[PDB]
N, CA, C and O atoms as CSV, one atom per row, in Angstrom:
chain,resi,resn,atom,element,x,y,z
A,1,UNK,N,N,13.930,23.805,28.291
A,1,UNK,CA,C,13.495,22.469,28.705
A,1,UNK,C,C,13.128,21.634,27.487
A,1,UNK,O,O,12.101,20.955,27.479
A,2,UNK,N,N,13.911,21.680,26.530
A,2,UNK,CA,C,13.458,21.609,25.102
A,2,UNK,C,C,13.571,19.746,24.812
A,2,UNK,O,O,12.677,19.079,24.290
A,3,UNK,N,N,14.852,19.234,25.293
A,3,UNK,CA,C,14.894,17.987,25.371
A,3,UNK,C,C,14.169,17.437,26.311
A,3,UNK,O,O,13.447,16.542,25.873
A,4,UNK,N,N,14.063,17.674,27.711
A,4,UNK,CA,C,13.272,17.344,28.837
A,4,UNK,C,C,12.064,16.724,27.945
A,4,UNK,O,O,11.714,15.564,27.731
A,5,UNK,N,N,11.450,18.305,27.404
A,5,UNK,CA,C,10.010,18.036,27.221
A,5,UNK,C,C,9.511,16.705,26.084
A,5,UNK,O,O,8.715,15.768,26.029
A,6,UNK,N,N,10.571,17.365,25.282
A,6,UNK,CA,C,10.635,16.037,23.937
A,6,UNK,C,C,10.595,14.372,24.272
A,6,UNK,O,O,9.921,13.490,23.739
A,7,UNK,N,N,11.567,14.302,25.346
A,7,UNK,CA,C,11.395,13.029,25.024
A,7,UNK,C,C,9.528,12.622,26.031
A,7,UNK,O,O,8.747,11.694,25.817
A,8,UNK,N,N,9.430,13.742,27.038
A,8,UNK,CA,C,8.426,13.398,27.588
A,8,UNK,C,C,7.381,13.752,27.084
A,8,UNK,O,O,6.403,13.542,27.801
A,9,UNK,N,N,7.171,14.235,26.077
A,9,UNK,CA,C,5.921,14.163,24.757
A,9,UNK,C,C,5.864,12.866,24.465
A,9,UNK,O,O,4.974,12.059,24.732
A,10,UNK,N,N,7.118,12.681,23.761
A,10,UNK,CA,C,7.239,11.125,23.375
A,10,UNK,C,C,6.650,9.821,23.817
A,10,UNK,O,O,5.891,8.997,23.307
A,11,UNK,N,N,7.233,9.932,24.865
A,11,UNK,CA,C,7.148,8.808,26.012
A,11,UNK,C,C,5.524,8.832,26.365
A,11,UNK,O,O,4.980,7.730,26.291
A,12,UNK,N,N,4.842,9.749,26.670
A,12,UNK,CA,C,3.616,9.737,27.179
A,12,UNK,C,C,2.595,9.696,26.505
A,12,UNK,O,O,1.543,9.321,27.022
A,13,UNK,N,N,2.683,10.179,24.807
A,13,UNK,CA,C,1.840,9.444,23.483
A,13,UNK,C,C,1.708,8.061,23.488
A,13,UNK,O,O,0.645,7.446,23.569
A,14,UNK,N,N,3.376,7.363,23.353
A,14,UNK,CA,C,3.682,6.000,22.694
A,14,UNK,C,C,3.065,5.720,23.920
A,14,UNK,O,O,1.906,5.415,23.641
A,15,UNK,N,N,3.301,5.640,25.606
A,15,UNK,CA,C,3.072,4.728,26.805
A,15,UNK,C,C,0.602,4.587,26.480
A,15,UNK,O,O,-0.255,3.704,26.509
A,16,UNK,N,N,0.648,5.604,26.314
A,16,UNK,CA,C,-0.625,5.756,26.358
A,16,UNK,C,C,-1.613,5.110,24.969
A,16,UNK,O,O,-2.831,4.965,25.065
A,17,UNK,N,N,-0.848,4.786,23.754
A,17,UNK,CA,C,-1.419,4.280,22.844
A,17,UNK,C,C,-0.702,2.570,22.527
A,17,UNK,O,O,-0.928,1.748,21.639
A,18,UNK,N,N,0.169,2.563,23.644
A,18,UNK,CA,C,1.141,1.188,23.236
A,18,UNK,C,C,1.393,1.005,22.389
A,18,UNK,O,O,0.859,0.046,21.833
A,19,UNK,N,N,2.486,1.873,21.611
A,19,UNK,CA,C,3.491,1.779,20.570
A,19,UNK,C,C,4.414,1.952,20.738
A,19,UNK,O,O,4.695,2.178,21.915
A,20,UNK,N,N,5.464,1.974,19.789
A,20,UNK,CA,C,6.703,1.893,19.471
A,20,UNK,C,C,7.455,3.614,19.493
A,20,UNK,O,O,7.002,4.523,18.798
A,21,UNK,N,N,8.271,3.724,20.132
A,21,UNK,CA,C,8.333,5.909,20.168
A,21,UNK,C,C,8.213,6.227,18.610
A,21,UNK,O,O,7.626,7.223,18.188
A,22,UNK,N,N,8.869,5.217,17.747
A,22,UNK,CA,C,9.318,5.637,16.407
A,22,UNK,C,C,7.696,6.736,15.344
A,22,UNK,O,O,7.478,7.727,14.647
A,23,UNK,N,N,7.246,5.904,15.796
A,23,UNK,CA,C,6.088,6.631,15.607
A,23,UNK,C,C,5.225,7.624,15.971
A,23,UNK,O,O,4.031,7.783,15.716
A,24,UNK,N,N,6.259,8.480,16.812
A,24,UNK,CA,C,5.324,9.659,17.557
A,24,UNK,C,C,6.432,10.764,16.630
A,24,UNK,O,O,6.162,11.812,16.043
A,25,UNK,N,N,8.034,9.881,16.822
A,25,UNK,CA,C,9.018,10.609,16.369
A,25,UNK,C,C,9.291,11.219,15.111
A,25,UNK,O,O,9.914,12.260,14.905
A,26,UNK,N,N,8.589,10.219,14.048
A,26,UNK,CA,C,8.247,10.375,12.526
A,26,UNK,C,C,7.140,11.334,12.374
A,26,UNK,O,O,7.124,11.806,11.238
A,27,UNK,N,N,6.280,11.744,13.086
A,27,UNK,CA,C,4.904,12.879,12.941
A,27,UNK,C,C,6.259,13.768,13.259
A,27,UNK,O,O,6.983,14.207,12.365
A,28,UNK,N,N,6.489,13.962,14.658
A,28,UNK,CA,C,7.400,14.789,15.083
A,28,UNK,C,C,8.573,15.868,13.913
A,28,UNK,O,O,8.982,17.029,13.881
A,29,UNK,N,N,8.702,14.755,13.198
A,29,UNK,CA,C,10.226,15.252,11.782
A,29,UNK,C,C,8.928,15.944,10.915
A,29,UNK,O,O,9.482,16.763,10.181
A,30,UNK,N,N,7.816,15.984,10.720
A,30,UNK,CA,C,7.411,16.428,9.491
A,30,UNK,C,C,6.234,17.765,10.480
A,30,UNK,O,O,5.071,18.043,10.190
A,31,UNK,N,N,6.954,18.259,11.466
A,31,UNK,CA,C,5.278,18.935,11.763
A,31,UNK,C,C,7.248,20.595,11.767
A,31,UNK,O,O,8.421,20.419,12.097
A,32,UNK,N,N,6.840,21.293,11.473
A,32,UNK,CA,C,7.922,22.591,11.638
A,32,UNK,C,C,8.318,22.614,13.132
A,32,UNK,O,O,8.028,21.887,14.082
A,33,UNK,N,N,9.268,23.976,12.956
A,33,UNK,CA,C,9.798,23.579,14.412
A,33,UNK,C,C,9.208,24.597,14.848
A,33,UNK,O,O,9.701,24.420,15.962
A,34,UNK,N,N,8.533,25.604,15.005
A,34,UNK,CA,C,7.651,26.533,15.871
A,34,UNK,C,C,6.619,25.346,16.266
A,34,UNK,O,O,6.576,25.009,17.449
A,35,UNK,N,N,5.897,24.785,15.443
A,35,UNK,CA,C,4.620,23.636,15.484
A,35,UNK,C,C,5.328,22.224,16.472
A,35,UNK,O,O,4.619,21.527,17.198
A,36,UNK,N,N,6.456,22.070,16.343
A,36,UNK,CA,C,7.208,21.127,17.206
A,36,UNK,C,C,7.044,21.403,18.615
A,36,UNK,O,O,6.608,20.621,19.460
A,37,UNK,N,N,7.502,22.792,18.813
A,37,UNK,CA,C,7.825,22.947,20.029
A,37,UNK,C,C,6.604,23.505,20.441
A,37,UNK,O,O,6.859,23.554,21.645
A,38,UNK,N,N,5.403,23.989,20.340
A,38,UNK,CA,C,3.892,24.265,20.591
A,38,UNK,C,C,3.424,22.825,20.992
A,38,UNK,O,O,2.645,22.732,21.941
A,39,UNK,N,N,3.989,21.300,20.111
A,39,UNK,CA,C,2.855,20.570,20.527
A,39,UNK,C,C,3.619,19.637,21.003
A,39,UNK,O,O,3.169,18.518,20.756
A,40,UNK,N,N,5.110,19.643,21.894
A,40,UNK,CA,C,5.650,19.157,22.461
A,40,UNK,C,C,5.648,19.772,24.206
A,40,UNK,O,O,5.681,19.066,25.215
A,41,UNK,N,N,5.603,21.112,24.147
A,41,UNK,CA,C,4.972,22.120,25.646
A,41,UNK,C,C,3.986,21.996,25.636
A,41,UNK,O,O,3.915,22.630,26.689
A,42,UNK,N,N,2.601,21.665,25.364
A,42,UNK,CA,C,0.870,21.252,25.253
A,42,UNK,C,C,0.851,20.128,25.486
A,42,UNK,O,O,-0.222,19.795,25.990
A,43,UNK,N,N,2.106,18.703,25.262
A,43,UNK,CA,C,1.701,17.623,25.647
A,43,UNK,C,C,2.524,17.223,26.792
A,43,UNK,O,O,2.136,16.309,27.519
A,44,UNK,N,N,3.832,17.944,27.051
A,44,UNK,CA,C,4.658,17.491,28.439
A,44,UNK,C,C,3.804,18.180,29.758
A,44,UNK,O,O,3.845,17.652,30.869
A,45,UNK,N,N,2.983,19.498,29.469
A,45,UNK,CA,C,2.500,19.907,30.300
A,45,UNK,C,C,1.280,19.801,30.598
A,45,UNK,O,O,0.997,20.543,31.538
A,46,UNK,N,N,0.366,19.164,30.188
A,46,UNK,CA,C,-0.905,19.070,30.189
A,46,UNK,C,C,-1.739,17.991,30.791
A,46,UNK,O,O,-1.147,17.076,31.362
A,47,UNK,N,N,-3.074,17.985,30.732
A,47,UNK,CA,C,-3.128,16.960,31.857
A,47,UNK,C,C,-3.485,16.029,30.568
A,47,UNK,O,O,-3.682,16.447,29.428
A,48,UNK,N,N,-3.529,14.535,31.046
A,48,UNK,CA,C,-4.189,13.405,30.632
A,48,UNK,C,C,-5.302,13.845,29.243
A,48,UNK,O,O,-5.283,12.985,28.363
A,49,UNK,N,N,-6.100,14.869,29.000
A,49,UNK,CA,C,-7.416,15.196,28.425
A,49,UNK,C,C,-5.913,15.410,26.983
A,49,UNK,O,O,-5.737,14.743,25.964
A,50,UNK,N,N,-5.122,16.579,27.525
A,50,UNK,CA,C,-4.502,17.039,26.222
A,50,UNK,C,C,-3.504,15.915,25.707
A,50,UNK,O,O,-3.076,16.014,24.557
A,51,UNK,N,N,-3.090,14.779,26.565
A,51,UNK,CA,C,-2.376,13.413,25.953
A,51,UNK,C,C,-3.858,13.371,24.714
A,51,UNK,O,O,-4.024,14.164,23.786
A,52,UNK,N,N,-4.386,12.685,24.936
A,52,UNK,CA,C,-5.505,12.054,24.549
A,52,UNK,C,C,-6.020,13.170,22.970
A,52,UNK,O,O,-6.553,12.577,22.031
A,53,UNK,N,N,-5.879,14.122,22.904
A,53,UNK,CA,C,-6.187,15.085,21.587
A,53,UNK,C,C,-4.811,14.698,21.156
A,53,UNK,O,O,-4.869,14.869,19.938
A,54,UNK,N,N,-3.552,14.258,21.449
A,54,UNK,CA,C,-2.411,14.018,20.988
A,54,UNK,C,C,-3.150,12.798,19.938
A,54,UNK,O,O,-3.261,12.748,18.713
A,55,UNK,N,N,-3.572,11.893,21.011
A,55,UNK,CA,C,-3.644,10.748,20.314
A,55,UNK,C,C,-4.401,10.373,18.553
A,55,UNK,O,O,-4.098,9.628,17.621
A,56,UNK,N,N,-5.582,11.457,18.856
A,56,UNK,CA,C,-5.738,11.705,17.160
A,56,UNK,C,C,-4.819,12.201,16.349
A,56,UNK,O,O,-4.788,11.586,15.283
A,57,UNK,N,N,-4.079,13.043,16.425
A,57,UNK,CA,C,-3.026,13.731,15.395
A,57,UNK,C,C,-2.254,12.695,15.037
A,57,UNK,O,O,-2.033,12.512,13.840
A,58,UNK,N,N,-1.730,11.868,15.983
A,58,UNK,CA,C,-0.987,10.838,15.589
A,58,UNK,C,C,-1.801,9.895,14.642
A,58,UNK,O,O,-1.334,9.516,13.568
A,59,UNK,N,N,-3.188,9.492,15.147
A,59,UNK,CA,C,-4.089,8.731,13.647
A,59,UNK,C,C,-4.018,9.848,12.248
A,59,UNK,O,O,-3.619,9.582,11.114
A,60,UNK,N,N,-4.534,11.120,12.760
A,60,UNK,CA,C,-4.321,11.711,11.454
A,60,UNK,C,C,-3.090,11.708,10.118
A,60,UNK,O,O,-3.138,11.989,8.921
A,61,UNK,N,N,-1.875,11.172,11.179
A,61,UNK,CA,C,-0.643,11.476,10.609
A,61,UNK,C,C,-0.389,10.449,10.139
A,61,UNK,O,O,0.242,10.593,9.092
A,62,UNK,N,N,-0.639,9.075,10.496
A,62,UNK,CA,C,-0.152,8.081,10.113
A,62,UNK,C,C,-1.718,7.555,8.742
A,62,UNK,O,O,-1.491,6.754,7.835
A,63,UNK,N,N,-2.857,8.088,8.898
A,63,UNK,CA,C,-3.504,7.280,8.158
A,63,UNK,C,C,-3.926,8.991,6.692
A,63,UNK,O,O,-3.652,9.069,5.495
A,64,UNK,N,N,-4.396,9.651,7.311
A,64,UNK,CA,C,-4.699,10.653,5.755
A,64,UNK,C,C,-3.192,11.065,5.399
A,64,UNK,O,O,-2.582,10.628,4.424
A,65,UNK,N,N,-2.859,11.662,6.015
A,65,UNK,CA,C,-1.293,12.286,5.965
A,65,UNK,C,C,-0.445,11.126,4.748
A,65,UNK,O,O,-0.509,11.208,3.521
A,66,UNK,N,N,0.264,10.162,5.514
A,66,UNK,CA,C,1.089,8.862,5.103
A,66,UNK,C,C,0.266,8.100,4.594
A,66,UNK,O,O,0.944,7.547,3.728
A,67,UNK,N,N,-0.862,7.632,4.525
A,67,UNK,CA,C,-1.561,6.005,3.936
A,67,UNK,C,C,-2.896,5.947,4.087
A,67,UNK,O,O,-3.080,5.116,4.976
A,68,UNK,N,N,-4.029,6.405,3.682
A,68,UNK,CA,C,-5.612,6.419,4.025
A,68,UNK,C,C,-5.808,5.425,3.876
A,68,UNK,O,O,-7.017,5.401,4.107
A,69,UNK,N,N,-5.395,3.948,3.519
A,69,UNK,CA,C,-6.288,2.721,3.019
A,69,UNK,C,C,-6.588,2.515,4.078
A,69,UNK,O,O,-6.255,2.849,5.215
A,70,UNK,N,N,-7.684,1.550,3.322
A,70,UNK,CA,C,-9.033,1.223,4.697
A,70,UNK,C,C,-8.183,0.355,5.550
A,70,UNK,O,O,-8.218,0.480,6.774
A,71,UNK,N,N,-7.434,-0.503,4.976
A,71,UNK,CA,C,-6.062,-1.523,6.051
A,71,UNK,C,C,-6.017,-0.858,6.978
A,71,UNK,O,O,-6.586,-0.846,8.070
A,72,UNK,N,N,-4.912,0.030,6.239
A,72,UNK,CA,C,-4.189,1.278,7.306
A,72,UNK,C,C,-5.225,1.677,8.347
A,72,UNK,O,O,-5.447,1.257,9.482
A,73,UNK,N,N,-5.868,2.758,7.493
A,73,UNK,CA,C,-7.245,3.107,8.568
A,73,UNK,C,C,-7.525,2.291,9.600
A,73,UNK,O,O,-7.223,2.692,10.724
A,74,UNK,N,N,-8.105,1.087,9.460
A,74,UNK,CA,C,-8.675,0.134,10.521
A,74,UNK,C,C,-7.588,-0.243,11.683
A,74,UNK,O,O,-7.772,-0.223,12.900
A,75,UNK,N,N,-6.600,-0.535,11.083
A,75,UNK,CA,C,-5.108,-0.841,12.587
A,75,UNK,C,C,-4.984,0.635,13.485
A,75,UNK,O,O,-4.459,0.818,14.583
A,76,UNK,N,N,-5.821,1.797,12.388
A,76,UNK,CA,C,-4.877,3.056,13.403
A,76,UNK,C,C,-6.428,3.103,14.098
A,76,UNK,O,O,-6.407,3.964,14.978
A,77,UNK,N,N,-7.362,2.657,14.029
A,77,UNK,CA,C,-8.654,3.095,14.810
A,77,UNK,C,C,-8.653,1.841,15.482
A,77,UNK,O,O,-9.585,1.954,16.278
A,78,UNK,N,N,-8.122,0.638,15.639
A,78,UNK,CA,C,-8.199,-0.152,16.749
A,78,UNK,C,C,-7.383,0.338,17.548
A,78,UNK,O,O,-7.591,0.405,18.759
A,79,UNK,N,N,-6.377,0.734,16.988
A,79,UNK,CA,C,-5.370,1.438,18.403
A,79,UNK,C,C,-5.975,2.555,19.456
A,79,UNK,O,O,-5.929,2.443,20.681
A,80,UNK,N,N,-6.727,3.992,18.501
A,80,UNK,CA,C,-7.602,4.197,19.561
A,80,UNK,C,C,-8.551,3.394,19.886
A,80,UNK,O,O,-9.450,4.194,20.144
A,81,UNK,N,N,-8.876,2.611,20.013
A,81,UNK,CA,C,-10.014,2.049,20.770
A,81,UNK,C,C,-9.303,0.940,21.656
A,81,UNK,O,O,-9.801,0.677,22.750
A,82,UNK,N,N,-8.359,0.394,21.304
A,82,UNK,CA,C,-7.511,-0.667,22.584
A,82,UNK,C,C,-7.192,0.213,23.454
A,82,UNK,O,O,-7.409,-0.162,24.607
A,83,UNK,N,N,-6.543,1.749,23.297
A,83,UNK,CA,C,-6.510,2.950,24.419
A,83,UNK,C,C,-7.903,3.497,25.016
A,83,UNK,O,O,-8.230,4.352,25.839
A,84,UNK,N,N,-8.434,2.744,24.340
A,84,UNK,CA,C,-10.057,3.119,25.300
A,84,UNK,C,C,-10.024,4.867,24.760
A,84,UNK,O,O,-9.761,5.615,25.701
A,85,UNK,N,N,-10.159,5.300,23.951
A,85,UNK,CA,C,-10.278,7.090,23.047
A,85,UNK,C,C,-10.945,6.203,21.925
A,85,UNK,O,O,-10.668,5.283,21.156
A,86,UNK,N,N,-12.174,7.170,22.354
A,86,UNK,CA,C,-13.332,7.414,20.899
A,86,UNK,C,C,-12.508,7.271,19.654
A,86,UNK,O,O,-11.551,7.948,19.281
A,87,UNK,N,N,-13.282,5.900,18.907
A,87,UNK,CA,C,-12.580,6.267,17.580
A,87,UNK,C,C,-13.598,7.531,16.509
A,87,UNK,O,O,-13.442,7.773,15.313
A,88,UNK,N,N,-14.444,8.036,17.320
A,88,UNK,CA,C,-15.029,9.018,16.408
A,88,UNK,C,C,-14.176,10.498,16.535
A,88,UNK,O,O,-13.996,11.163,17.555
A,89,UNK,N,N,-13.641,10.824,14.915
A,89,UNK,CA,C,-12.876,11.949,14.684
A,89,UNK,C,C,-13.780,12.878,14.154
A,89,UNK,O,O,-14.641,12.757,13.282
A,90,UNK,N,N,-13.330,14.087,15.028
A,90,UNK,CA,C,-13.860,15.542,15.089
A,90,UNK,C,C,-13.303,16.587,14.105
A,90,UNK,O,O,-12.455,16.523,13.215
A,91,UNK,N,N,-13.932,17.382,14.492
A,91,UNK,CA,C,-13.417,18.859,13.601
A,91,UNK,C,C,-12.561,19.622,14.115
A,91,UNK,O,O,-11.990,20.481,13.443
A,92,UNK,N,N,-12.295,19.407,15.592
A,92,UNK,CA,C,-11.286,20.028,16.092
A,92,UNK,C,C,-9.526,19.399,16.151
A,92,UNK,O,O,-8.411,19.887,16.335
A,93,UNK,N,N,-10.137,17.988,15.861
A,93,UNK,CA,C,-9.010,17.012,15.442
A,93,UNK,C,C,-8.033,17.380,14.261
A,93,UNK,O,O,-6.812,17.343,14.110
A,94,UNK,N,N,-8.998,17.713,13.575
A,94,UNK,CA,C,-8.614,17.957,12.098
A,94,UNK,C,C,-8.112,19.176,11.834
A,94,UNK,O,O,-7.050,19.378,11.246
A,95,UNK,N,N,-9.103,20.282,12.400
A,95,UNK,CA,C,-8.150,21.799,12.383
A,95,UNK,C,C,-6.699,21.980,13.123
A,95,UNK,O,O,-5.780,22.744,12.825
A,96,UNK,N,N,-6.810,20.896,14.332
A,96,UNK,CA,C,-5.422,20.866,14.736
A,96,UNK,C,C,-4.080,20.463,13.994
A,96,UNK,O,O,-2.935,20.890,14.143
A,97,UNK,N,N,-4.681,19.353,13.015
A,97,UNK,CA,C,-3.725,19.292,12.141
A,97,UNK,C,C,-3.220,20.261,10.965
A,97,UNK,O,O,-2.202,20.506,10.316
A,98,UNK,N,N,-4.462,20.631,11.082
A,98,UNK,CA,C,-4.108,21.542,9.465
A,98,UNK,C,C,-2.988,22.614,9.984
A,98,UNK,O,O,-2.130,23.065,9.225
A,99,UNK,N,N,-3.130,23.104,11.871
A,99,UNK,CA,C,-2.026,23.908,11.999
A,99,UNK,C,C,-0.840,23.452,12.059
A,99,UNK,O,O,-0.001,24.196,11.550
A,100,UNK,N,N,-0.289,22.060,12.695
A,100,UNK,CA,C,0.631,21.842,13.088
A,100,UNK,C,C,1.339,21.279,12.088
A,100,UNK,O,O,2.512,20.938,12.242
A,101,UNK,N,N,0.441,21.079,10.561
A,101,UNK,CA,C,1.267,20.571,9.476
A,101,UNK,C,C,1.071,21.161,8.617
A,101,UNK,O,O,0.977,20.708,7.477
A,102,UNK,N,N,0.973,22.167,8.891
A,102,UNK,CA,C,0.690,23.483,8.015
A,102,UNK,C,C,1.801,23.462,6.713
A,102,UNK,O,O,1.374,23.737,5.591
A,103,UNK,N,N,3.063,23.167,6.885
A,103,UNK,CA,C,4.099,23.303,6.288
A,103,UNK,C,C,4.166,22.030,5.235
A,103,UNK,O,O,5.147,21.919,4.499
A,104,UNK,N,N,3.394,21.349,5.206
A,104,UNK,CA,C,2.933,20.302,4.398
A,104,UNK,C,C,2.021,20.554,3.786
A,104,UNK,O,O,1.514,19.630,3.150
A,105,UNK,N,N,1.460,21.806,3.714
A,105,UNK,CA,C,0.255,22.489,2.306
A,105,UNK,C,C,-0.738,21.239,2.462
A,105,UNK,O,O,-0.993,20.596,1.443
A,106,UNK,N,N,-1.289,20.873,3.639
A,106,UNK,CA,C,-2.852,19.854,3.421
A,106,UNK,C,C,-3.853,20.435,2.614
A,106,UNK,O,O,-4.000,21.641,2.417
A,107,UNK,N,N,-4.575,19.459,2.130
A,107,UNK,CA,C,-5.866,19.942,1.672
A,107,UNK,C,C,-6.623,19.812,2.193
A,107,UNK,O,O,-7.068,18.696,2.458
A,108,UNK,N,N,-7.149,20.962,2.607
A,108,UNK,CA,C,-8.102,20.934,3.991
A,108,UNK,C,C,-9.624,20.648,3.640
A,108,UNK,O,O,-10.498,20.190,4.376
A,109,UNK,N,N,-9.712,21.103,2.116
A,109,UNK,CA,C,-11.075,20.010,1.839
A,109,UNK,C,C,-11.162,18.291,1.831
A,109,UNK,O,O,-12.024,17.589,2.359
A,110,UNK,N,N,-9.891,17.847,0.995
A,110,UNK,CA,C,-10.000,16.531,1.413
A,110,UNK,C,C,-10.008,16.166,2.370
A,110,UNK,O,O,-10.634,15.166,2.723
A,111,UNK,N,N,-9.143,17.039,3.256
A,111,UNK,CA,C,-9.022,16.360,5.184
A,111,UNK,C,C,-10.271,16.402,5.587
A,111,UNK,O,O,-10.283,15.690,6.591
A,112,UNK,N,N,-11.515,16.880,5.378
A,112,UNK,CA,C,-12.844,17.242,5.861
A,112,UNK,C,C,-13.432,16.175,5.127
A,112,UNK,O,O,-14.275,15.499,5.718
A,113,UNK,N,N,-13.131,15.882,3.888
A,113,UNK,CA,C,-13.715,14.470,3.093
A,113,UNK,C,C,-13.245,13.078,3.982
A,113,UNK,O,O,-13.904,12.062,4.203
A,114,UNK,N,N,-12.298,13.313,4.269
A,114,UNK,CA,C,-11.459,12.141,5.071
A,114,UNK,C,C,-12.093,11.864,6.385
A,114,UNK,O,O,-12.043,10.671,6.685
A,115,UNK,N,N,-12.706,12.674,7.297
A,115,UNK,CA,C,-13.117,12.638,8.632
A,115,UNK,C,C,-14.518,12.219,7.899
A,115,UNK,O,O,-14.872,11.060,8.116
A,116,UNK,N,N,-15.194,12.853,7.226
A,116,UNK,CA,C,-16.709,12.444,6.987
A,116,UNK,C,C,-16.548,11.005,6.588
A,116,UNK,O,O,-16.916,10.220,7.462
A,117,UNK,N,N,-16.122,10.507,5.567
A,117,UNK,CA,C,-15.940,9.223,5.027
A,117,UNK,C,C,-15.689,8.615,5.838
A,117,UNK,O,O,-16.474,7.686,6.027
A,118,UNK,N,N,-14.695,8.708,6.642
A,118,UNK,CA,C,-13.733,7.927,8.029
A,118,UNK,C,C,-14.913,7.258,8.903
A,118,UNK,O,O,-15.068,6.037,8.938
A,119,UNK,N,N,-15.863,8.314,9.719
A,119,UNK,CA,C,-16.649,8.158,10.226
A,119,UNK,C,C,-18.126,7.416,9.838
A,119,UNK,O,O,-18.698,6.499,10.429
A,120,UNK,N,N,-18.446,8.014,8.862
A,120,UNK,CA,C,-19.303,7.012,7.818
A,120,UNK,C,C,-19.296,5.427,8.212
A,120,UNK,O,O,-19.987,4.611,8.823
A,121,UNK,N,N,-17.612,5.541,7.193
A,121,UNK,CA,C,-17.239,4.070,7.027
A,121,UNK,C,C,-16.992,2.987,8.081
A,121,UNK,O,O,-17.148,1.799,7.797
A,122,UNK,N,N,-16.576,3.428,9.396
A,122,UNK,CA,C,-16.026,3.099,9.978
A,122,UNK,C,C,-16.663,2.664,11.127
A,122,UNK,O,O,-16.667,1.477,11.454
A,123,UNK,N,N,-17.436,3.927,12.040
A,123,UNK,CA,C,-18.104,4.034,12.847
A,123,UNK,C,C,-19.386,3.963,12.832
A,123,UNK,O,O,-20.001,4.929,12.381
A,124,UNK,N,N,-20.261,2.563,13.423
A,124,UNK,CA,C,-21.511,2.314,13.099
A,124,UNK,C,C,-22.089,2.962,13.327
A,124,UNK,O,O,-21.637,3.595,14.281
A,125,UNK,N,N,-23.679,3.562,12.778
A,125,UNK,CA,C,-24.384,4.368,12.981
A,125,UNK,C,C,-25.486,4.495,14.404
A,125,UNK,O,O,-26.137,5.474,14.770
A,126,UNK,N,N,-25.406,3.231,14.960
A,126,UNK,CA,C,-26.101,3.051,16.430
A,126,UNK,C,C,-25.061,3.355,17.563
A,126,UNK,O,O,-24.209,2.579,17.998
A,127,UNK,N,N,-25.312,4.672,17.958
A,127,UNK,CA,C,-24.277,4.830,18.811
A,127,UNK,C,C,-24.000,3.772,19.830
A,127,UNK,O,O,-22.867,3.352,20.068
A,128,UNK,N,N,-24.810,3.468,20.267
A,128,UNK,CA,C,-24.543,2.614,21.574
A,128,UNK,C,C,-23.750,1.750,21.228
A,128,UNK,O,O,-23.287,1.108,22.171
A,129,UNK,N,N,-23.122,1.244,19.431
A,129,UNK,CA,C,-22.098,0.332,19.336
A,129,UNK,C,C,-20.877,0.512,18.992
A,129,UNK,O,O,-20.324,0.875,17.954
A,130,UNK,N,N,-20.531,0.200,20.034
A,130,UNK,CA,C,-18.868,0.849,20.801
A,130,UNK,C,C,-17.760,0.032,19.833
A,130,UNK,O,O,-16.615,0.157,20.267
A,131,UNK,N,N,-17.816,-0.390,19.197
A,131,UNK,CA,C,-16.726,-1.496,18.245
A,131,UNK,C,C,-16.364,-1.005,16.946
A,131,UNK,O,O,-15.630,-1.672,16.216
């Protein structure tokens, strides 16, 4: 069900973050193909909760991965937040990446510098402010 599932990974990232597929498809080319097909069956089959852990990997991929500037950064954390998903990034966010792009040798200390800073910088310190 290998195409089935693919394009319906696809489709149900991009529909859920309102983007363009090209951009689910480009994480897609750089994650291996054991790691492809693990997080293409986890997202065709899963409910709504496991879309939504999709939706960080895709920030991870497009902003530490490809481009950390604060620019960058800020367009990929309004996107979660126009999808209504916490722009506060976790540790489980991050270990997910380190597996699925494993084949890209991350540095998993900077990626841990990247979420602390991220959050810092980004996310005000009064929770109650949602912006």
């Amino acid at each position: 069900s290998n195409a089935s599932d693919t394009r319906k990974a696809i489709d149900t990232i991009s529909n859920l973050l309102k983007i363009k597929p090209i951009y689910i498809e480009s994480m897609l080319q750089e994650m291996g193909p054991r790691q492809t097909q693990m997080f293409i069956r986890s997202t065709s089959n899963g409910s709504a909760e496991e879309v939504r852990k999709a939706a960080y990997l895709v920030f991870i991929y497009h902003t530490f991965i490809k481009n950390p500037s604060d620019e960058n950064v800020e367009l990929w954390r309004n996107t979660l937040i126009r999808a209504q998903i916490s722009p506060i990034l976790a540790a489980e966010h991050t270990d997910a990446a380190l597996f699925y792009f494993a084949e890209l040798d991350l540095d998993a200390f900077e990626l841990a510098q990247f979420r602390r800073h991220y959050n810092l910088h980004f996310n005000p310190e009064p929770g109650t402010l949602l912006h």
